Nucleic acid binder design. Structure first.
Lengths: 92, 79, 96, 104, 75, 93, 104, 94
DNA sequence: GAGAATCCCGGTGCCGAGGCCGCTCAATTGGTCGTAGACAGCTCTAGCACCGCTTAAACGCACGTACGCGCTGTCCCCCGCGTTTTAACCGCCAAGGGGATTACTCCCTAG
DNA sequence: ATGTATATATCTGACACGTGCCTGGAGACTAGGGAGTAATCCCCTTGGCGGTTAAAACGCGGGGGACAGCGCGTACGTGCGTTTAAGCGGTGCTAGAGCTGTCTACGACCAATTGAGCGGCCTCGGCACCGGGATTCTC
C-alpha cells in the first residue's frame, strides 16, 4: 500500500474544526511537513541515542530532544500532553 | 543567448513582490546573475542526484531533497 | 491624473495580497534546459520539478529583495544599487 | 483494538513504529516512544490546524488555501522561529511596509 | 551586577579584533544584551544535555554538541 | 595627541596575535549565572567555560566584522545600535 | 596481513569499518566503502598537512600552531567554503584592512 | 586505564612521511581529531540519507562516490575520487 | 472642484473538491528468550572556596581636533506614456522512449 | 667609563625511543535474500502545428533625487593620577564522575489474523470571471 496521512488529519480537522475543509495541494504541503518533522526528530533521537552510547531509545531521551529543538511554552504544552498520553497508555 | 528570458518587467515584478520601491538599471543583470548561479548550484546538486540512481529524469523529489541538502527546503512536493 | 508614483503602492499592495507566480514558465524552463544541456547530454524533466524550482526561485527572490529593501532603508536611500545586494550576499555567507 | 484507540490517540502506533524501525535510527527501540511521538504530532497539527482555521475564518473561506497556512506559520513568532528555514510553495509573504516608505 | 561584570575595555578589544576604528558609548549595553541572550540560548541546550547525561554538573562534550546544534560548530 | 597612528598600531597588534580578550572570572560568573537560570550551583567545568569563551569571542568578532563592513558601506566609520540590529536581522535573527 | 596494507593505504580500514558497523548508518555495508572513506580522509588530511607545512615554513617554525592552520585554511576558497561556517577555538583574524579605512 | 579511540598517531606519521623534519603539538592532534570525526560523521550521514533516498539498503563504493562528488566544493573531490578508485583497485588487485 | 482607479453587488458554467464501495495488504495479538537499562555499591579526580602578595589593567578628569552632520546648487537619469511587434499561450495530435514491475538467481555480506 | 664579543661552564627543560599487554581485526566456515537483469506494458513529454494577444522594445517629456562641496560643533582619542581586584599559587575539603556487579523485564522475533485506509468512480456547489454601479486619493 502507498502510505500517506490523509484520513488521519481529516479526522483531526473534523475533531477541531467540523465546518472547515482543505485542498489537495495543502494536503501535500502538510504531508511534506509531517515527513520533515518526523525525519528531524528521528535523526535527533538517533544522535542523542548515540551520544551517551545507549542502544535503546525511550520516552525521556526524545522528551529532552523536544525540549531541545522546540522553544519554551510549546515545549511545555507538548511535554504535558505527551506525559498524559504515555500515562493513559500505561494506565491501560 | 537565453539568459534574457528573465527580462526587465519580470525582475520588476520580483522587486514589487519583494518590497523595493525604486529600481535602477544595474539591478537587473546582477539579479539574473545571482539567479543563474543559484539555479546552477541546484542543478549541480541535481546532476549528481540523477547520475547516482542511473535515472535520467529530474522529478520534484529531486529538487526538493536538493533544497533539503542546501538547507532551503520547500513543502508541497514530498518530505 | 499624472502622478510621480501611486500606481506602485497599489501594485505592491496587490502583490502582497496575491500569491500567484510572477515569473513566466516558458523562459524559466528554457533557461534550466540550457543549464542542463550545458552540464550533461539528453536529460528528461518533469513539470512538478520546474514549478518546484519556480517556487524556490520566487522565494529566494522575495528573500533577497527583502534583504536589499532593509539594507536600502538602513542606507537612508530609496533607490536600490548593486552595492546593497553585494553586501547582502557577503553578509549572508552566500559568496564567502 | 488498535493501539491508538487503546492509548486514546488518533495517529496509529504501528505505522509510526514501523517508520522508526526500518528507518535505521535505532536497533533497539521503545514502545512509549511511538505513542509519545503520536502525541507530539497531534499537538503540532492541532496548533497548525487551529492557526489555519483562524487564518481562514477572518477571510471568510470554508476551505484552507496555501495562503491561509502561510498566514498560519508567519504570524505567530514561536512557530516562525521554529520553522523559519522552510519556504512555502504558493504561500507568498505577509504585507509588510516599512515606516520610511510611508508618504508624508 | 552580572551585566557590568564584563568590562568595557574587553568589548573594546573585541571591537579592535573585529576591525572597528571608532566605536560609540551606547553600543556596550546592547552588545551585552545580545551576548546574554546568545549565551542563554547556548546554555539552555547545554543544561538540557546535562539533564540528558544524568549528571548535576557540566562537562566538555555537552557544550560541544550544543555548539554543533545551531550551526556554529566548535573546533 | 597623535590621532590614528596609535589606533593603527592597536588594530595591527590585535590582528596579529591570538590573545584572549574576555577575562576568565567575569565571564565565568556571567555564564555561571546564565546557568543558574536553568541549573543553580551548577558544578562547572574548565573545558566548558573556555568553550563558551571561544564561542562568544568568535560570535562577537563575526558580528563586529559584519557591523564595521556595513558601517563602511554606510560612509561612516562610527557604530550605532541600529547597525547591530541590522546585522542581526539580516544575518538571520 | 592487515587489510589496510592489502589496500596499500595508510589510514586504517578496520577502524573505520568498526565505526561503520555500530555507527548506525546502514544495516548492510560493502567492502570498498570503508576503503573509499579512508582514501578521501587521507587525501583531505594530506592536503591540509601540505598547507600547514607551507604555513609553518612561511612563519619559519618547526611546530604547527593552530594559527598556522588558520592562515592555511583561509588562503584557499575551497576550504573557505567548506570551513566557512565553522567556528575555531583560538583562531584569530586574518590580516584584512580595507583601503578606504586606511588613512590617506 | 580506559582504551581511548583516536587516530592521532595516523595523522602524526603521515605528517612524518610527507614532512620528515616538522614537529607538532598535542592541541593540534586534538584539533584535527575533531576535524576527521566531524567529516567522518558528516559524509557517513550524507551517504546514509542518499542511499535511503535511492531506497537502497546498503553502502558500497557507489553511494559514497556520488556523496563525495557532490558534497565538498571542489578540487579535493577531483583528486579524491581518482585516488579512491585507485585505492579500491589496489585492494581488488590484492 | 474633476478623473482614473479602485471596492462592491449580482449572474454563470465548471471542474475540481467531498462520499462510497472493493478489497488488499498492514496493524494487532500471543509466545519466547537473551540481552541491555537500572539500581546498588565501589574508588579517587577534580571542582569549589578562601588567603595573601604582586601589579598591570581599569576609571576619571582634561582638552583638541578631525569627522558626523546640516544645508545647497546641480545635472540627469529614471519615471509615465504613446506606438509597433514579437514572442507567449492555449487547444490539440501522434510517438516513442523511458519508468515500474514482474520473476528467477546467485553471491556476498551477515554471523 | 662602559659596552661587548665570543668562547666558556653549569645546568635545567621539553621532547623522542625501548618494553608490557590485551583485545579486536583477520582467517575460516555457513546461509539467505538483495541486487542483477530484462521484458513488457503504459504514459507523458517532447515536437509541431496555428491563431491571437497581453505585453516587451523604443523613443520622448519632465522632476525630484543623487553628486560634491563648504561650514559648525563635539566626541572620541590621548595622557597622567589614582585605584583594584585580576592573576598565581597554595591549601583544604568533599561532591560526584566513573567503573563494576548483578538482576529481570522491556522488547526483538515469529506465526496467525482481521480491518481499514488507498483508490476508481460518482456527484454537485465555491470561487474566479464578467458586467456595471458606488467610492476614494490625487491633480
Amino acid at each position: 500500500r502507498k502510505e500517506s496521512y490523509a484520513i488521519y488529519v481529516y479526522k483531526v480537522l473534523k475533531q477541531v474544526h467540523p465546518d472547515t475543509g482543505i485542498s489537495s495541494k495543502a494536503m501535500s504541503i502538510m504531508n511534506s511537513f509531517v515527513n520533515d518533522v518526523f525525519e528531524r526528530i528521528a535523526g535527533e533521537a538517533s544522535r542523542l541515542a548515540h551520544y551517551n552510547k545507549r542502544s535503546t531509545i525511550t520516552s525521556r531521551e526524545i522528551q529532552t530532544a523536544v525540549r531541545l529543538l522546540l522553544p519554551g511554552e510549546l515545549a511545555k504544552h507538548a511535554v504535558s500532553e505527551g506525559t498524559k498520553a504515555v500515562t493513559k497508555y500505561t494506565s491501560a | 543567448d537565453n539568459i534574457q528570458g528573465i527580462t526587465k518587467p519580470a525582475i520588476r515584478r520580483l522587486a514589487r513582490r519583494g518590497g523595493v520601491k525604486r529600481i535602477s538599471g544595474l539591478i537587473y543583470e546582477e539579479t539574473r546573475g545571482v539567479l543563474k548561479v543559484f539555479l546552477e548550484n541546484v542543478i549541480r546538486d541535481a546532476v549528481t542526484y540523477t547520475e547516482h540512481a542511473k535515472r535520467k529524469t529530474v522529478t520534484a523529489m529531486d529538487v526538493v531533497y536538493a533544497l533539503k541538502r542546501q538547507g532551503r527546503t520547500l513543502y508541497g512536493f514530498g518530505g | 491624473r499624472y502622478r510621480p508614483g501611486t500606481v506602485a503602492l497599489r501594485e505592491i499592495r496587490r502583490y502582497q495580497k496575491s500569491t500567484e507566480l510572477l515569473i513566466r514558465k516558458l523562459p524559466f524552463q528554457r533557461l534550466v534546459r540550457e543549464i542542463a544541456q550545458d552540464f550533461k547530454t539528453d536529460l528528461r524533466f518533469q513539470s512538478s520539478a520546474v514549478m518546484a524550482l519556480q517556487e524556490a526561485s520566487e522565494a529566494y527572490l522575495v528573500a533577497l529583495f527583502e534583504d536589499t529593501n532593509l539594507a536600502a532603508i538602513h542606507a537612508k536611500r530609496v533607490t536600490i544599487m548593486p552595492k546593497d545586494i553585494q553586501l547582502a550576499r557577503r553578509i549572508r555567507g552566500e559568496r564567502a | 483494538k488498535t493501539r491508538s484507540s487503546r492509548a486514546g490517540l488518533q495517529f496509529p502506533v504501528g505505522r509510526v513504529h514501523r517508520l522508526l524501525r526500518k528507518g535505521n535510527y535505532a536497533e533497539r527501540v521503545g514502545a512509549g516512544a511511538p505513542v509519545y511521538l503520536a502525541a507530539v504530532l497531534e499537538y503540532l497539527t492541532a496548533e497548525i490546524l487551529e492557526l489555519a482555521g483562524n487564518a481562514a475564518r477572518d477571510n471568510k473561506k470554508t476551505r484552507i488555501i496555501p495562503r491561509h497556512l502561510q498566514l498560519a506559520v508567519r504570524n505567530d513568532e514561536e512557530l516562525n522561529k521554529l520553522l523559519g528555514r522552510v519556504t512555502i510553495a504558493q504561500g507568498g509573504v505577509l504585507p509588510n511596509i516599512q515606516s520610511v516608505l510611508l508618504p508624508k
